[PDB]
Design a protein. Structure first.
Lengths: 147, 140
């Protein structure tokens, strides 16, 4: 089962809610404005503005994604053993996931893997910001090698 | 003829010479974009301060507050703006609640006209009342 599979369970998926977060920030009038505000021309979060991005984003995740994820995993266990992918372990922890939990890393630069991948919905930079948000969302635990 | 609009409302043979090839491998340090955005903010002129000055009608504009109070509030606004700029809950650099006892500091306000009198009533209103106390009408 793909990580994003939980996303389209809601008719408005999690991604457009994340896109609409921008309306809750003063001085930002569009998602594009949010992107140019949070990044410093070198695709680096300002390490403070990303703070309020997390401030706004975390309630969305913990109040919307977590329960639907809980039901999704509960039903998924019924069909039998499955391989489940996620983006941050806290997703599975807050969803009361059942089964062996593995945190795995990769010997690559994951961030560069995004903006080259064309045909993105909200723009590649949005995907970069999303990846940063998930990485900040993850817990403190040493991920083993994927091998 | 060339016409320019207004920004303000008014009264109304081979040719490939061997040096032109592009081999850009130089990354400026510091970066061009960073210093450009930095100097973009310093470019901006300082804001206007119209308050306390008359308008075309003759009535001074601004707020009706004690000048001491406006000085303190205006310092607090600056501290808040500084905090917002630094992207912190506190401003590390404060213009208010310093050690200096600047109690006598004054700032321009709309409370006092150019004559040293109070703006409790607009100047045009004073002129109207003064001039209407002498008018005479047709005989009975």
């Amino acid at each position: 089962v793909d990580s994003d599979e939980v996303g389209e369970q809601m008719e408005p998926t999690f991604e457009q809610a994340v896109m609409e977060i921008y309306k809750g920030i003063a001085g930002v009038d569009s998602l594009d404005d949010l992107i140019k505000w949070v990044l410093n021309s070198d695709l680096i979060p300002h390490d403070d503005r990303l703070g309020q991005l997390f401030q706004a984003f975390l309630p969305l995740a913990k109040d919307l994604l977590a329960p639907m994820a809980r039901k999704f995993y509960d039903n998924s266990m019924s069909e039998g053993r499955l391989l489940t992918f996620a983006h941050a372990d806290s997703e599975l922890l807050n969803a009361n996931y059942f089964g062996h939990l593995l945190r795995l890393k990769i010997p690559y630069i994951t961030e560069v893997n995004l903006m080259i991948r064309k045909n993105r919905e909200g723009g590649e930079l949005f995907q970069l910001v999303l990846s940063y948000l998930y990485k900040m969302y993850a817990t403190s635990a040493q991920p083993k090698w994927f091998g | 003829m060339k016409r320019i609009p207004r920004k303000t409302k008014g009264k109304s043979p081979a040719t490939t010479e061997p040096g032109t090839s592009n081999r850009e491998q130089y990354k400026a340090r510091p970066g061009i974009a960073s210093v450009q955005r930095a100097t973009e903010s310093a470019e901006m002129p300082m804001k206007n301060n119209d308050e306390g000055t008359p308008d075309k009608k003759g009535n001074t504009k601004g707020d009706l507050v004690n000048e001491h109070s406006e000085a303190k509030d205006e310092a607090d606004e600056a501290t808040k703006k500084q905090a917002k700029d630094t992207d912190k809950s506190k401003a590390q650099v404060t213009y208010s609640d310093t050690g200096i006892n600047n109690a006598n500091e004054l700032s321009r306000s709309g409370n006092v006209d150019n004559e040293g009198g109070s703006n409790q009533k607009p100047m045009s209103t004073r002129i109207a009342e003064a001039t209407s106390a002498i008018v005479s009408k047709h005989p009975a």
